[PDB]
Amino acid sequence: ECISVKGRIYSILKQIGSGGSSKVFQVLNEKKQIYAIKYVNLEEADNQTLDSYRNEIAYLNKLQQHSDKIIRLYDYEITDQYIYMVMECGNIDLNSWLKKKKSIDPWERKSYWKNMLEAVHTIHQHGIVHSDLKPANFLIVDGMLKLIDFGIANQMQPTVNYMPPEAIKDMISPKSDVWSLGCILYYMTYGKTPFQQIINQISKLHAIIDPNHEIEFPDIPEKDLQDVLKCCLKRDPKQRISIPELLAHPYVQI
Numbered sequence: 417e418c419i420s421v422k423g424r425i426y427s428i429l430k431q432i433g434s435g436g437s438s439k440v441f442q443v444l445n446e447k448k449q450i451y452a453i454k455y456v457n458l459e460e461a462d463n464q465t466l467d468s469y470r471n472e473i474a475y476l477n478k479l480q481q482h483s484d485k486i487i488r489l490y491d492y493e494i495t496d497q498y499i500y501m502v503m504e505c506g507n508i509d510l511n512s513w514l515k516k517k518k519s520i521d522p523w524e525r526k527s528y529w530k531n532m533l534e535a536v537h538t539i540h541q542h543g544i545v546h547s548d549l550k551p552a553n554f555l556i557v558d559g560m561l562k563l564i565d566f567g568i569a570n571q572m573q574p575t576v577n578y579m580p581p582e583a584i585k586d587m588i589s590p591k592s593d594v595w596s597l598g599c600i601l602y603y604m605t606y607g608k609t610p611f612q613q614i615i616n617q618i619s620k621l622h623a624i625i626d627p628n629h630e631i632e633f634p635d636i637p638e639k640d641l642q643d644v645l646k647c648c649l650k651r652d653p654k655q656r657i658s659i660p661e662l663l664a665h666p667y668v669q670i
């Protein structure tokens with residue numbers, strides 16, 4: 417019912433995430449302030465798991481200085497037995513927010529886009545490619561989006577719809593994250609991801625890599641947004657827009 421880390425006591429309001437050897441709790445400290453604590457049980461864990469968990473805290477810790485669109489890490493306790501990570505708690509994950517919304521304020525959708533670009537840009541400048549970017553991986557906190565993780569440990573959970581063609585064709589570059597950001601932006605403008613409607617999964621992966629399968633970009637008022645989506649959703653990573661290009665794009669600048 418309570419969690420201690422580097423002395424201090426947090427009371428559990430509830431569990432919010434799960435996977436493999438870990439749990440995430442929404443939590444209060446003694447001044448009744450809210451945090452997310454991640455718990456990782458290490459007693460039964462492979463060295464490939466441990467290394468991933470160590471790499472994650474190292475990276476999360478270094479990236480704090482670089483951008484406020486990365487989740488804050490206040491403190492952590494690491495032992496042969498466990499990890500506790502005390503991190504900022506958000507209002508809601510972007511996936512659960514998207515399922516509520518009847519529709520999105522176009523100026524809200526742009527503001528989020530910017531936030532996602534700045535987060536992912538920051539991890540790219542430290543030589544990290546997330547590779548598994550879904551809306552679940554972003555947090556709304558003070559009307560801004562913050563990236564939650566780095567693709568370095570991958571157990572945690574609150575689809576194959578966000579998968580770039582080249583990750584499937586590989587029997588990966590930063591351009592891989594542009595595809596998935598493109599799928600999230602497409603979801604935010606059309607109320608679906610591009611291959612949402614394809615029903616079975618084997619048939620989805622066929623669509624994602626098949627050149628003859630054209631994606632539909634319906635006419636919308638925001639001609640720029642349409643351009644961002646068509647550039648993010650090119651199957652050829654080499655012909656696909658980069659993050660530094662995306663930040664110079666009229667959609668975020670004009």
Ligand SMILES: COc1ccc(Oc2cc(NCCC(F)(F)F)c3ncc(-c4ccc(C(=O)NC5CC5)c(C)c4)n3n2)c(F)c1F
Pocket residue numbers: 432433434440442452454472476487501503504505506507508509552553555564565566572573574
């Ligand atoms: C991909 O795995 C997950 C994705 C989204 C999740 O949802 C949420 C939802 C939050 N909303 C507050 C909702 C509340 F409390 F009001 F119900 C929230 N606040 C801080 C963190 C949070 C912060 C850090 C991390 C984390 O593990 N980051 C990695 C160390 C870099 C995680 C998984 C969640 N989250 N996470 C989740 F629980 C996951 F495990």
